[PDB]
Amino acid sequence: MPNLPGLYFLQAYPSEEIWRLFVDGRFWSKENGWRGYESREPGCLNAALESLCSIALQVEKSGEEFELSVDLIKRIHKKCGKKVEELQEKNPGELRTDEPVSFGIPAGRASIKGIEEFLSLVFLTEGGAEFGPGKAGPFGPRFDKNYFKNLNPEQIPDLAKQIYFDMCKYGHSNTNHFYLAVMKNVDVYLEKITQSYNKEIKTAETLDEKLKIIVKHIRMYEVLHPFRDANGRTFVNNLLNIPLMQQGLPPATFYEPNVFDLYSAEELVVVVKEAIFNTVEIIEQSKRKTPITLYGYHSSLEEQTKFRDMLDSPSYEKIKHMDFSDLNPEKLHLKTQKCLSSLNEQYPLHRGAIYLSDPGEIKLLLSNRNESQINQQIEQGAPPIYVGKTPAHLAVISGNMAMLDELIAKKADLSLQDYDGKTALHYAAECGNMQIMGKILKVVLSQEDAIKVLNIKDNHGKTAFHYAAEFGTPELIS
Amino acid sequence: MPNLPGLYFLQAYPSEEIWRLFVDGRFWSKENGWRGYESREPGCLNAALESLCSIALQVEKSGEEFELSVDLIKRIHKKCGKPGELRTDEPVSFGIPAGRASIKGIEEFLSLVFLTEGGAEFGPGKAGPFGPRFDKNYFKNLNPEQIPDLAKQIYFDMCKYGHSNTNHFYLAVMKNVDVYLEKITQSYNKEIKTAETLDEKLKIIVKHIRMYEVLHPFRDANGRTFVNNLLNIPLMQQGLPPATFYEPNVFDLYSAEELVVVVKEAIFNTVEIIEQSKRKTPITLYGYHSSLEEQTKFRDMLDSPSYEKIKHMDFSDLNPEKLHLKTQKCLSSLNEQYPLHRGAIYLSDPGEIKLLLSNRNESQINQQIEQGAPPIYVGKTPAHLAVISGNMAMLDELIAKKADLSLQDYDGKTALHYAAECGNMQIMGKILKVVLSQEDAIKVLNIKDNHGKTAFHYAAEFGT
Numbered sequence: 043m044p045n046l047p048g049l050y051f052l053q054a055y056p057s058e059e060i061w062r063l064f065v066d067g068r069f070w071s072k073e074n075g076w077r078g079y080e081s082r083e084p085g086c087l088n089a090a091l092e093s094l095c096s097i098a099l100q101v102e103k104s105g106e107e108f109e110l111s112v113d114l115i116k117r118i119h120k121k122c123g124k125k126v127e128e129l130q131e132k133n134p135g136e137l138r139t140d141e142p143v144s145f146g147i148p149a150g151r152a153s154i155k156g157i158e159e160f161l162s163l164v165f166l167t168e169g170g171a172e173f174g175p176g177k178a179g180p181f182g183p184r185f186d187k188n189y190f191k192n193l194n195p196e197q198i199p200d201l202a203k204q205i206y207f208d209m210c211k212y213g214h215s216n217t218n219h220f221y222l223a224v225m226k227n228v229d230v231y232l233e234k235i236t237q238s239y240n241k242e243i244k245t246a247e248t249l250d251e252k253l254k255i256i257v258k259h260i261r262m263y264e265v266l267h268p269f270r271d272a273n274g275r276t277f278v279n280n281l282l283n284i285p286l287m288q289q290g291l292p293p294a295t296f297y298e299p300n301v302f303d304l305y306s307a308e309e310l311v312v313v314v315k316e317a318i319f320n321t322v323e324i325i326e327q328s329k330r331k332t333p334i335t336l337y338g339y340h341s342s343l344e345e346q347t348k349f350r351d352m353l354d355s356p357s358y359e360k361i362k363h364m365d366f367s368d369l370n371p372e373k374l375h376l377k378t379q380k381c382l383s384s385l386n387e388q389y390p391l392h393r394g395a396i397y398l399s400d401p402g403e404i405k406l407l408l409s410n411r412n413e414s415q416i417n418q419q420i421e422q423g424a425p426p427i428y429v430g431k432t433p434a435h436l437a438v439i440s441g442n443m444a445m446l447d448e449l450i451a452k453k454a455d456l457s458l459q460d461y462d463g464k465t466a467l468h469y470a471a472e473c474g475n476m477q478i479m480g481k482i483l484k485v486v487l488s489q490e491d492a493i494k495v496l497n498i499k500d501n502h503g504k505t506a507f508h509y510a511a512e513f514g515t516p517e518l519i520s
Numbered sequence: 521m522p523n524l525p526g527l528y529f530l531q532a533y534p535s536e537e538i539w540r541l542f543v544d545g546r547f548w549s550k551e552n553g554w555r556g557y558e559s560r561e562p563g564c565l566n567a568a569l570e571s572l573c574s575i576a577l578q579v580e581k582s583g584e585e586f587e588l589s590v591d592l593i594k595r596i597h598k599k600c601g602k603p604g605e606l607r608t609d610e611p612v613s614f615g616i617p618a619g620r621a622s623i624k625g626i627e628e629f630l631s632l633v634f635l636t637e638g639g640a641e642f643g644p645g646k647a648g649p650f651g652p653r654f655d656k657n658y659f660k661n662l663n664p665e666q667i668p669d670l671a672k673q674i675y676f677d678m679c680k681y682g683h684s685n686t687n688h689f690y691l692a693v694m695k696n697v698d699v700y701l702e703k704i705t706q707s708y709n710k711e712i713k714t715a716e717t718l719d720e721k722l723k724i725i726v727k728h729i730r731m732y733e734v735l736h737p738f739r740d741a742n743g744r745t746f747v748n749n750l751l752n753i754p755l756m757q758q759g760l761p762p763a764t765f766y767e768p769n770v771f772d773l774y775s776a777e778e779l780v781v782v783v784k785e786a787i788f789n790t791v792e793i794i795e796q797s798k799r800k801t802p803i804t805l806y807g808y809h810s811s812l813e814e815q816t817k818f819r820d821m822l823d824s825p826s827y828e829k830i831k832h833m834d835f836s837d838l839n840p841e842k843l844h845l846k847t848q849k850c851l852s853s854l855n856e857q858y859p860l861h862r863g864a865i866y867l868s869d870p871g872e873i874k875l876l877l878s879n880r881n882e883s884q885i886n887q888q889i890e891q892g893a894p895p896i897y898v899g900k901t902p903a904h905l906a907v908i909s910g911n912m913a914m915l916d917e918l919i920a921k922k923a924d925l926s927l928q929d930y931d932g933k934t935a936l937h938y939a940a941e942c943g944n945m946q947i948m949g950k951i952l953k954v955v956l957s958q959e960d961a962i963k964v965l966n967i968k969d970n971h972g973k974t975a976f977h978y979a980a981e982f983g984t
């Protein structure tokens with residue numbers, strides 16, 4: 043038997059695209075893929091790759107059958123925190139004791155069922171964690187109200203609705219609430235979660251059962267937030283991939299990984315599956331010598347040569363150039379294909395806009411669909427990228443010309459705004475695609491309301507042409 | 521020992537941009553500079569360069585004086601064909617759109633008496649599979665007393681059909697081409713000796729190069745032979761730089777006077793090319809930002825022995841500054857009539873631009889230039905030209921000065937149509953922000969050009 047049959051997918055993953063399993067897909071379009079992430083903290087790209095591979099290297103060939111252990115976990119977060127001096131806290135790879143870490147969460151990174159689950163985590167209650175609406179400070183947030191104070195667990199379903207309602211009133215992408223992690227017993231809870239995992243994982247028989255257990259526990263970790271820094275990479279970009287590859291699944295290439303706090307375990311399974319699905323299509327497209335176009339980003343040959351020259355990781359080289367113990371580098375593949383087949387099922391018009399490029403397939407998919415299906419906006423709980431969007435919005439942000447054409451043919455509503463206030467037009471302007479902008483405007487002008495539609499403002503009070511006029515000048519943070 | 525001395529400006533011309541004196545400036549934006557011209561005839565750039573340099577190496581050498589003889593004219597061609605010889609009876613013809621014509625130019629064309637007696641044809645017609653079937657030929661029973669009134673009507677007729685549309689055709693002379701070629705040669709050498717100032721000399725040079733073009737003595741490559749090669753010889757003989765052109769194919773229906781202005785700005789281009797390269801300033805003329813890969817591709821493709829000899833020729837036997845100040849004063853003619861428009865084409869510095877547009881009135885900022893001005897200006901506002909050049913700085917200041925962005929040029933197109941066609945999201949955005957704060961926004965966005973197309977029709981095609 044092997045231990046990490048997943049390593050197979052890691053080795054198959056095309057080297058010049060390996061940055062994709064560390065840079066969130068949401069940055070690729072606007073930051074020339076990996077370059078923006080690289081410039082904000084150079085070489086973390088390697089460091090992150092070196093961490094995964096070196097950790098996975100001392101697993102697939104040791105132990106008995108694997109059991110998770112806190113020491114491993116810490117053994118992980120030793121990359122990458124500062125690690126530099128001086129005092130008085132903390133060991134650049136050790137655990138928080140009383141140190142307080144906090145961050146905010148916008149409605150678009152949350153779900154009602156997710157909030158319900160969050161409030162239900164008992165260690166947050168007894169550990170002294172804080173969560174609620176408030177204000178962000180230079181030394182912590184200032185809460186207007188902390189829900190973990192005097193929390194009646196009978197009231198959590200009603201409370202979860204209210205919280206979600208409040209977060210939306212503030213804005214889909216706006217940070218209103220805040221979370222301050224536990225300041226008591228992190229070592230205890232870290233061990234509790236580890237034991238829970240190793241207990242439950244052994245009960246699960248199917249791969250879907252196992253996924254549920256993996257994401258449920260990875261969440262608890264993240265929410266637990268045991269380190270001073272880099273809890274997200276340490277768990278979701280690194281740790282999550284170990285149980286995934288232990289089950290013989292590929293590692294995850296995420297659009298937006300930062301939903302392991304206020305999404306529910308069930309909804310996270312979906313998030314991880316579509317992430318996984320993304321590693322599979324990366325590999326397939328590269329195998330078929332097809333240019334990779336995911337998430338509206340087209341890598342230039344100069345960007346690719348800059349990255350492989352920059353690529354530098356001994357443990358990655360060892361995994362790329364290894365033997366194929368086997369057997370089943372093809373069941374491995376058929377196993378994950380059956381596991382991911384649950385995706386196709388729900389809101390396919392949106393997934394089509396993201397992943398489909400063949401005009402014939404697209405035309406077929408949109409046949410027999412009604413006005414409400416072609417105009418459907420996906421609701422809370424779906425993976426972040428879908429919430430509030432029509433297939434049209436997603437066609438524009440992917441650059442899916444074929445899909446946009448068919449949607450226009452099917453007389454889709456291009457005036458509808460997603461929960462950021464943006465219409466298909468705001469996105470076309472932001473993407474700087476002259477053609478898709480033109481197609482949309484041709485349609486908009488042949489309608490009654492053309493001026494009202496062109497003057498639509500989003501959550502920044504901006505019109506589509508505000509963004510258009512801004513295209514190609516540089517960003518402006520916070 | 522120099523004359524010709526102009527060979528000084530050819531050497532100064534930056535090697536990796538030397539294609540610019542062969543590829544029309546109108547192609548650069550939409551054909552990645554030189555690459556589109558090269559792909560239609562591979563090797564044609566080096567052949568044109570080899571022709572100019574090889575022929576210029578034989579002239580400065582013995583001619584003292586020099587003489588544009590029909591022998592060198594034939595030798596020029598001999599280096600620009602499948603073949604070196606003259607036409608006898610073979611018909612050669614082409615069409616001309618109003619935008620390549622002027623009223624004064626048409627007057628002059630009808631006045632070329634060799635076109636009347638030689639049997640050349642020109643009037644409204646249609647394009648044939650072996651020749652144009654003309655509806656009228658103005659050279660038949662032409663009263664030369666009526667040519668000023670006829671020239672106005674021909675121009676109006678060419679405009680009714682459309683600024684960029686071809687209604688009128690020209691079939692060249694089929695009798696006595698060898699005779700007329702010799703007549704023009706003798707006329708040139710006679711008249712050039714009469715002229716004293718550089719402006720007088722220019723008038724004579726362009727007038728004769730025009731006549732050489734209009735008489736289409738060769739089967740092929742009359743343009744390359746007479747305007748991209750021959751024209752540069754008398755120019756350099758006078759100590760002027762060779763000419764870089766936006767659109768030069770105006771040596772038929774433009775007048776000699778107006779062609780002087782066309783050549784002056786073509787020369788101005790060579791001066792701006794050299795200056796920008798000397799200052800290490802990248803080049804952004806007419807809309808082509810050459811990529812480093814393109815430059816390397818051209819540098820590797822460059823291959824012309826006679827060019828190499830001129831690039832390493834020693835012009836220590838010559839005063840560059842006399843030469844330089846002479847062409848300086850000659851070109852200081854340019855930025856006077858319609859100054860802005862030229863600003864929109866050439867100016868990139870926001871400070872200079874802001875200064876230039878200070879205390880200009882609504883009629884100056886909205887001014888559309890009339891027929892006879894070099895092709896690129898005709899019918900356009902400064903705003904149109906800012907958009908086609910990608911002159912962001914100029915467009916910004918024009919918007920600040922509340923320029924009218926609804927005004928359409930003689931192709932029916934507004935600043936918006938051009939922004940769509942150029943595919944510039946930013947300039948399109950700036951324009952639309954303005955248009956929507958106006959009462960007439962919908963009427964303006966729906967403006968159709970000569971092709972009945974709306975700005976967004978072009979936008980939706982962008983990337984074809």
Ligand SMILES: [Mg+2]
Pocket residue numbers: 144145146178179182183220
């Ligand atoms: Mg905070």
